[PDB]
Amino acid sequence: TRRIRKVLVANRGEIAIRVFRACTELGIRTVAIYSKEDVGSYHRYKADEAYLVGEGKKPIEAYLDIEGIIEIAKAHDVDAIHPGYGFLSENIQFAKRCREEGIIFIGPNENHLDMFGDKVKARHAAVNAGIPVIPGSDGPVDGLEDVVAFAEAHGYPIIIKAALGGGGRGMRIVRSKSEVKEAFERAKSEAKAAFGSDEVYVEKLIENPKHIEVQILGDYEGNIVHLYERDCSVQRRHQKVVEVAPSVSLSDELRQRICEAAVQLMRSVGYVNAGTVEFLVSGDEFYFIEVNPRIQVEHTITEMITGIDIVQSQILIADGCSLHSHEVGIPKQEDIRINGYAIQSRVTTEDPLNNFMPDTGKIMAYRSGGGFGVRLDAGNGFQGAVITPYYDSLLVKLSTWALTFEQAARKMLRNLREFRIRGIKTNIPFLENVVQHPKFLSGEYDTSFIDTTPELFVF
Amino acid sequence: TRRIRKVLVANRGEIAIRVFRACTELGIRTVAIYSKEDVGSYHRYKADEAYLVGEGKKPIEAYLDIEGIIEIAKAHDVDAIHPGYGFLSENIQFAKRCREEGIIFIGPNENHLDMFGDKVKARHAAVNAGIPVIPGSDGPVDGLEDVVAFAEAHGYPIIIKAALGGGGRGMRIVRSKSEVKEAFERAKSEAKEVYVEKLIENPKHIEVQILGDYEGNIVHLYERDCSVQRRHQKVVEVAPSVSLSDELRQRICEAAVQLMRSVGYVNAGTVEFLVSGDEFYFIEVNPRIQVEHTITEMITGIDIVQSQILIADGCSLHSHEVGIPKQEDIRINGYAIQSRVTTEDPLNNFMPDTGKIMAYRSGGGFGVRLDAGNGFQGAVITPYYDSLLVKLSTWALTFEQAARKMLRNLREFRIRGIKTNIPFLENVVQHPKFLSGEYDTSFIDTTPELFVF
């Protein structure tokens, strides 16, 4: 039976607002939480009722207050909590505590949150399921001949990483065999000097990939569907900037192989609810790299090309409904379709002329464009608002759909342009630069785009 | 260009919450007004701001205080007012004051309101546009032989009415020539000067949605079928009409466009017709939005309220912002049905029940729109307004499916603490005559079972 009368969103800003709408639409009452920091936040007011959480804790911590949140749910007849993204949404402790208190958790099961929070467990999950992964040594290599033969087996470019460098430091790229001997000896002595261990791993470098992600929905009855892919190749220093759906110049036969790859893995683990599978792509090959056991900021553009409300589905799936049930109403795979293109970006208070440091303060004048095929998910982008340093400094999330990619791009550019802000800086001039650039407009581009095109940083 | 940054909704309940949605989806800030009575009304908390209006007036008059509404709008920097339906939404003096105070009126011009708020002025605009109307004597008849001849030209059945009387209190049907002699004779004695009209009996009731811009552009969004009526009240609307020919559909829609173009109508409006076989007849223009507007949005995929706001902001029908395709490219897909759940107890003559809702749960889901009025747990339903719990609209690829969803969702409502009309709504939507897709305005009033429970 449907149990969910009232839902609490344990989150803030645009994604809280997003789930409030989904709830109201479904006839479900809502509960927002806010920190002292958010006593003036827009989201506090878009819920049917709001309660202060994590009092005396810090700005970020007050949303991590697992016991105070749950104390609120039980205190006000909450049946289920939506975790949105990016706070407790992937936290195992939260989910099982909900389960103990008899509060439903909109999201997959804990063994899902665990298996996909560990890169090793996931890598194993994917190989078990028959999906390709990026070739790497499992431990640190024994010696030079190992790196040589790894390279003979997988082809350069390769990359050698210090063991204790963790991620992101003590890494060395090798493009040729004439390059490997010195590059290895060096990678040892340098990791030993900087971290204290000479141990290094090797990986296959998949260079300048397209970053392709697939949306997934599973019910408790084992049904799985993909809502096709979103293209997240437009990135600055590896952080997402503009997502496109579907991927413009992705082979449609390649589109197929990828998506099936994603369902085959999620079915093999019986993923329940909403989740995404990420791949890196080069030519005809693709490699699994991550699963996000939750919804994502950019879910919007898939909803637009498919016509499926993803957040409404999350809730219904959480109350026991199946993907093809009357209420969820998602069709069989072969009848799900994409129509046109959709693009998203996120207007922030990041000052591109100040190393993108987030500006703070009070927005004196605020006005936006909007319209058909335009979607305005506001964070705290409104006139008179007070933007603090504590959070995601997100003014509004902007999603634009049109029949043709070219059209979707004009729509985005035109609506970034229609914005009038007074009182704080924003990242609009950079967003403007990115989506107006011939390379993006070409539909054909990979993850090296932004980092490699310097004119994007002239204002 | 565009000037709308803030809109006040001069209304309450579902229609005001519906416009609050559109506004937010456009980056537009929202203000609500509530009467003292609606101090715990849901819509008050759904707007960005909210101010008590008409304090010290009756409940209805509260939402009729033009000067109190203007005041709130000026004091709070409102650029435009949405009247919704059913209060000041057709009030020429309301639109006049807005223009006066340079406040945009989300709706057509004052002359549109005037000509279409009068049956005579309306009939003349329809006629002057080449649109068929229902036959009548342009004045009182001179004697019996004129009635005879009127019916010979237009055909029985005819209707005889008194002048000092009015529609209803002074009206008599005549089906054959045998009656006219005695009927005409009676009408003269009873009414004690008479008029004659053709009777369009058991007509289907079809209305066409129209939109126009300040550039002179006009599109229809096809028709809604409102035949299903209890005592001429609308109970269940369907779109598109299930058993209405395409030729006839096309003919009826063009009639609506032709007529609205000829008057330069602007913003949202509806042209009502009565259809009989292959003939149809103009009867009314609703120069505002209607309750049923949901089901037309659903089949066409066009957001009418948002188009309303953008059109009043100067935006062209086919501009980037409004985004409506060429008339020829506008399509309909699937079917949509609307129902309104109220506290009308059909076991107490449909008298509106009041009180505190102790328990409330509804269904919901894909293809289901819930436009809440005051149907929520812990709500207190007063006898003063529309007494609406929730306006229910369902869409599906086929009519049968859309009917089943509507029926299925009605059955999921759990309401404890007060009566509703779901018992009637269910009987109506489950009946095979309605499911057949082939019914007219006589359906409800000639099917008694609908009132057994």
Q: How would DSSP label each residue in A202-258?
A: EEE---S-EEEEEEEEE-TT--EEEEEEEEEEEEETTEEEEEEES-TTS-HHHHHHH
How many C-beta neighbours within 10 Å does residue B10 have? 31
Note whether A372 contacts B303, CB cutoff 8 Å.
Answer: yes
Q: How far apart are CA B184 and CA B142, in angstroms?
A: 12
Q: How far apart are CA B215 and CA A105, in angstroms?
A: 52
Topology of domain B200-453, CATH: D-amino Acid Aminotransferase; Chain A, domain 1 (3.30.470)
Q: Which pairs from A42-45 meet CB under 8 Å and 24+ separation?
A: A42/A13, A42/A17, A42/A378, A42/A379, A42/A380, A42/A382, A42/A385, A43/A12, A43/A13, A43/A14, A43/A16, A43/A17, A45/B48
- Chain B within 8 Å of A408 (Cβ-Cβ)? no
Nearest chain B residue to A415 by CA distance is B321
Encode B224-242: b = buried (16+ Cβ within 10 Å), e = exposed: bbbbbbbeeebbbbbbbbb
**Both structure tokens of B188:** 């003269």
**Residue A110 three-state SS:** helix
Residues forming beta bridges with residue B34, ordered by sequence position:
B52
**Region for A290 from its dihedrals, namely left if φ exceeds 0, alpha if ψ lies in -120 to 50, beta otherwise:** beta
B29-34 and B49-52 strand pairing: parallel
| Cβ-proximal residues to B383 (8 Å cutoff; 6+ apart), any chain | B352, B354
Q: How far apart are CA A242 and CA A297, in angstroms?
A: 11
Cβ atoms of residues B77 and B12 within 8 Å: no
Q: DSSP character for A359?
A: P
Q: How far apart are CA A432 and CA B317, in angstroms?
A: 27
- Chain B within 8 Å of A196 (Cβ-Cβ)? no
Cβ atoms of residues B63 and B33 within 8 Å: yes
Query: Which helix or strand (DSSP H or E) is residue A381 part of?
Result: none
Secondary structure, 3-state, B353-367: CCEECCEEECCCCCC
- Our measurement of the distance from residue B242's CA atom to the centroid of its chain's CA atoms, rounded to an integer in Å, reads 19
Return the closest-CA partner of residue A176 out of A151, A154, A146, A208: A151
Sign of the alpha-carbon torsion through B291, B294, B299, B304: positive
Q: How far apart are CA A37 and CA A41, in angstroms?
A: 8
Return the closest-CA partner of residue B271 out of B218, B324, B311, B319: B218
Q: How would DSSP label each residue in A136-182?
A: B-SS--SSHHHHHHHHHHH-S-EEEEESTT-SSSSEEEE--GGGHHH
Q: To what resolution in angstroms was this structure determined?
A: 2.4
- In chain B, how long is the greatest CA-to-CA distance? 68
The yes or no reply on domain A206-459 and CATH 3.40.190.10 is no
Cβ atoms of residues A231 and A250 within 8 Å: yes
Which CATH code, of 3.30.1490.20, 3.50.50.60, 3.40.50.300, 3.30.429.10, is assigned to A134-205? 3.30.1490.20
**Nearest-10 Cα torsion for B284, B288, B292, B296:** 100
Q: How far apart are CA B235 and CA B205, in angstroms?
A: 12
How many C-beta neighbours within 10 Å does residue B98 have? 25
A6-9 and A80-82 strand pairing: parallel
Return the closest-CA partner of residue B300 out of B240, B364, B350: B240
The single residue listed with the structure tokens 């319209």 is: A371
Residue type, B250: Q
**Residue B349 three-state SS:** coil
- Chain B within 8 Å of A26 (Cβ-Cβ)? yes
For chain B, the domains span: 1-133, 134-199, 200-453
The alpha carbon of residue B323 is apart from the nearest alpha carbon of chain A, in Å, by 6
Q: Which pairs from B279-283 meet CB under 8 Å and 24+ separation?
A: B279/B132, B280/B132, B280/B206, B280/B248, B280/B251, B280/B252, B280/B255, B281/B132, B281/B133, B281/B134, B281/B200, B281/B203, B282/B123, B282/B126, B282/B131, B282/B132, B282/B133, B282/B134, B282/B255, B283/B133, B283/B134
**Both structure tokens of B269:** 């409006």
**Residue A292 three-state SS:** strand
From residue A336, alpha-carbon distances to A260, A329, B327 in Å are: 14, 11, 28
Note whether A371 contacts B323, CB cutoff 8 Å.
Answer: yes
Q: How far apart are CA B414 and CA A143, in angstroms?
A: 71
Residue type, B73: A
Residues forming beta bridges with residue A292, ordered by sequence position:
A276
**Region for A61 from its dihedrals, namely left if φ exceeds 0, alpha if ψ lies in -120 to 50, beta otherwise:** alpha
Query: Which helix or strand (DSSP H or E) is residue B34 part of?
Result: strand B29-34
Q: How far apart are CA B22 and CA B12, in angstroms?
A: 15
- Inter-axis angle of helices B304-312 and B293-300, nearest 10: 100
Note whether A376 contacts B25, CB cutoff 8 Å.
Answer: yes
- Chain A within 8 Å of B303 (Cβ-Cβ)? yes
**Both structure tokens of A130:** 């028959």
Residues forming beta bridges with residue B173, ordered by sequence position:
B159
Q: How far apart are CA B177 and CA B189, in angstroms?
A: 19
Q: How far apart are CA B193 and CA B176, in angstroms?
A: 21
Q: Is A240 a catalytic residue?
A: yes
Q: How far apart are CA A402 and CA A411, in angstroms?
A: 8
Note whether A28 contacts B377, CB cutoff 8 Å.
Answer: no
A347 contacts in chain B (CB < 8 Å): none
Return the closest-CA partner of residue A409 out of A459, A456, A338, A342: A342
**Nearest-10 Cα torsion for B113, B118, B124, B129:** 40
**Residue B352 three-state SS:** strand
**Both structure tokens of A202:** 């090797």
Q: How far apart are CA B197 and CA B174, in angstroms?
A: 10
Q: How would DSSP label each residue in B204-238?
A: EEEEEEEEE-TTS-EEEEEEEEEEEEETTEEEEEE
Q: How far apart are CA A184 and CA B324, in angstroms?
A: 63
- Chain A within 8 Å of B326 (Cβ-Cβ)? no
- Chain A within 8 Å of B323 (Cβ-Cβ)? yes
Return the closest-CA partner of residue A447 out of A218, A239, A226, A246: A239
Return the closest-CA partner of residue B241 out of B257, B231, B252, B255: B252
B29 contacts in chain A (CB < 8 Å): 382-383
Note whether B365 contacts A329, CB cutoff 8 Å.
Answer: yes
How many C-beta neighbours within 10 Å does residue B329 have? 8
Method: X-ray
The yes or no reply on domain B1-133 and CATH 3.40.190.10 is no
Q: How far apart are CA A412 and CA A433, in angstroms?
A: 12
Which CATH code, of 3.40.50.2000, 1.10.3720.10, 3.30.1490.20, 3.30.420.80, is assigned to B134-199? 3.30.1490.20
Cis status of the peptide bond prior to B157, with omega within 30 of 0? yes
Residue type, B196: V
Cβ atoms of residues B92 and B104 within 8 Å: no
Backbone angles phi, psi at B332, to 5 degrees: -115, 140
Q: Which pairs from A308-311 meet CB under 8 Å and 24+ separation?
A: A308/A227, A308/A336, A309/A22, A309/B366, A310/A215, A310/A217, A310/A227, A310/A274, A311/A18, A311/A19, A311/A22, A311/A82, A311/A274
- Choose the catalytic residue: B6, B46, B204, B234: B234
**Both structure tokens of A88:** 């407790």
B414 contacts in chain A (CB < 8 Å): none
Q: How would DSSP label each residue in B432-448?
A: HHHHTT---TTTGGG-G
Q: How far apart are CA B118 and CA B115, in angstroms?
A: 6
Q: How far apart are CA A310 and CA A292, in angstroms?
A: 15
Return the closest-CA partner of residue B3 out of B311, B220, B226, B427: B311
Residue type, A148: V
**Both structure tokens of A370:** 């909007």
The single residue listed with the structure tokens 């969103």 is: A9
Encode A358-385: b = buried (16+ Cβ within 10 Å), e = exposed: bbeeebeebbbbbbbbbbbbbbbbbbeb
Cβ atoms of residues A30 and A47 within 8 Å: yes
